[PDB]
Amino acid sequence: ALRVLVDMDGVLADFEGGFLRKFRARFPDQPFIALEDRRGFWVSEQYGRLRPGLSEKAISIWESKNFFFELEPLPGAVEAVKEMASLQNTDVFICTSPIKMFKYCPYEKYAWVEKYFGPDFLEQIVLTRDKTVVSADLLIDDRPDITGAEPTPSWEHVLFTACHNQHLQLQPPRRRLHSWADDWKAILDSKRP
Template sequence: DKVASVYEAPGFFLDLEPIPGALEALQEMNNMQDTEVFICTSPLTKYEHCVGEKYRWVENHLGPQFVERIILTRDKTVVLGDLLIDDKDTIRGQEETPSWEHILFTCCHNQHLALPSTKRRLLSWSDNWREIIDSKRGAGTVG
């Protein structure tokens, strides 16, 4: 498959540019009181380059302390937390009702999707992510 040959190639993940504002938002979240930030990411099925490159990317852009905050899993539903900001519109796994609220991060492949009124969207890292975190503070600790 032509598309797979691109994202399975050496350097694909390592050479990705950060989404504008993402690194700053992540650092700010990490410095917020009573907030724990983790990077929850899925490996490709053909993971030869993917896993190591994702770890190196995080270290290069966020520093070694964030490498300790990577959760690598094919099933994000089993990870505990209050929020999961993800660009995948549907996240399924072992847990039918995960502990976290899924916030859909808008990007080219999901911007056309209409969301139900119960689901929230983050348009960009300059959008209202602080309000989203604050809205969870009343319901418990953000993790």
Template sequence: MLVLVDMDSVLADFEAAFEEKCRLTHPDFEFIVHEERTTFYLADSYPPEFRTMIVDIYKQPTFFHDMPVIPGGVEAIRQMADLGWQVFVCTHPFYINEHNFAGKYYWAETHIGKGWGERVIFASDKTMIRGDILIDDKPEISGVNQPEWEHIIFDRTYNRHVTGKRRLTWSNWREVLAP
């Protein structure tokens, strides 16, 4: 089995990274309640007047290096690798922050393990990448190709409107992906 796993908000906690950085510079900023988030893009969950401030935080050089882990994700992909599955991290680059390339490489090497940086595929169009499954929190993924992979939704409040796709968390991945 060839497994592609998204990084942001699946393995790495992008939202927590934003909140940690934001607290340092804007201690009074009120964060949305995670369970009430309905938009895929975090910045869209806040009123437009905050967009510049939010984007400035995204642009910080260590934003991606410092993302906390989402519990269970790293263990799950290590276990998938132990099952003999080919696992790659497939992540859309964050073009407004050129440091994201180094940050995501560093993140994989540091949190998943030595050598995993080489398993990070940066893809502005994930339909260009072959695989059996793609685990991703984005509700719909499209591109120039008809994807070869099955999109398996990583369960988040903002993608619950999606039906007709398998859906998993890091607690139930073995049951969901069982043959």
């Protein structure tokens, strides 16, 4: 079977929108970064440049209970992955990194998957801080540079569009999946025998 790894935050689950909503609600008198203006992968670094002490306040949002659990799915994500997993000769794993503060995040990621994909889909979860040691044909992930212990990962990394990466020019033959409305089936079919 063709094997596809799908990232969670910024691909399945709307980490950026969730973060902004909760930040504004908790820190209504602080300045914030509109999603369109997000630059750089690390939210807290951008916030830290905007005002002193804002990096720590940003961090307190994703460390809070229910932050991960209450993320909304990105449009099309649940439908696409469900269809993808039902395709013949196609094994789909949700491959995601928990944050360092582990009190809520791993638990809530399991709970989120159960909620949107159902109990049977829990067998498809891989939690890891290193994706290069997970072998597959494809990795769909919004992070531009994915590295770790394995210098030559078996997967092709398809960059999932996010505001933070939308301007990035990629080194051919690297490619993008622009959203779940985009033609993911053609990408998968291009890797099949």
